[PDB]
């Protein structure tokens, strides 16, 4: 399996809005910010690394939501520190915004049903206070 890092990055404790970044391949569309994991790397590791090239975040690693099935580590994260300027909003371009958990999952179905897969996930455990 290719195995990838996912990361569900909210603004509070409250879960209520999540950071979503631009696509790569298309610009003006968004989804969940993450990528594949080098060998034998930690998923935890990797979705911490990653946010902060994408996103510029940082912040505190929470629980790992689920593995979804290539195969995604999901985790989620307390964002602390959003930096000006980051790695791909410099190379690339890359935008950033936060989203309420709603708007999300409403931008990312039409193009990223996975993605939206993951806050309906979320959401579903929030209900259950887990």
Do not use: N
């Not at 631009?22 to 969940?32: A, E, M, N």
């Not at 602390?80 to 300027?85: A, G, I, N, S, Y």
Request: proline content about 4%; some cysteine; glycine content about 8%.
């Amino acid at each position: 399996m290719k195995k990838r890092a996912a990361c569900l990055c909210f603004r509070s404790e409250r879960e209520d809005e999540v950071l979503l970044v631009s696509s790569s391949r298309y610009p003006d569309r968004w989804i969940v910010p993450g990528g594949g994991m080098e060998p034998e790397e930690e998923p935890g590791g990797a979705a911490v690394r990653e946010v902060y090239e994408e996103a510029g975040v940082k912040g505190k690693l929470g629980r790992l939501l689920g593995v979804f099935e290539h195969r995604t580590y999901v985790y989620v994260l307390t964002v602390t520190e959003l930096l000006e300027d980051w790695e791909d909003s410099v190379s690339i371009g890359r935008k950033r915004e936060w989203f309420k958990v709603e708007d999300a999952i409403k931008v990312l179905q039409c193009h990223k049903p996975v993605h939206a897969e993951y806050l309906e996930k979320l959401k579903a455990h929030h209900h259950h206070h887990h």
